[PDB]
Amino acid sequence: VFYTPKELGGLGMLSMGHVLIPQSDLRWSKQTDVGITHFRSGMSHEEDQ
Amino acid sequence: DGKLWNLNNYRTDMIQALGGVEGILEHTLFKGTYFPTWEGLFWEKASGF
């Protein structure tokens, strides 16, 4: 809610710091004809965003 | 003196790190508005009244 740019509704905060995004916050889901499908973003086995 | 800084890369990587539009907007009431897509959309900073 802080670092999302103002165009997408966020506050557009600029961070001069070290903030980790929990992986549980990088999950979404969408509904199509075959039902509901869930997506992540970090395919690579890296740390939290 | 010109604009001695640029935040294009910063905002690009901020959207990329938050999971893009799909990842960001799962946190919002956007899917409750039932807009087919985010392309032809605009905010209104101040209400008409």
Binding site: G17, D48 | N9
Partner: peptide, 22 residues
């Protein structure tokens, strides 16, 4: 996961400040 802005004194000091800039 807390979302608290942690100080980067000694954190992310490996990279230069010219990285990720064009």
């Amino acid at each position: 996961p807390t979302g608290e802005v942690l100080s980067l004194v000694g954190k992310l000091e490996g990279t230069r400040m010219g990285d990720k800039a064009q």
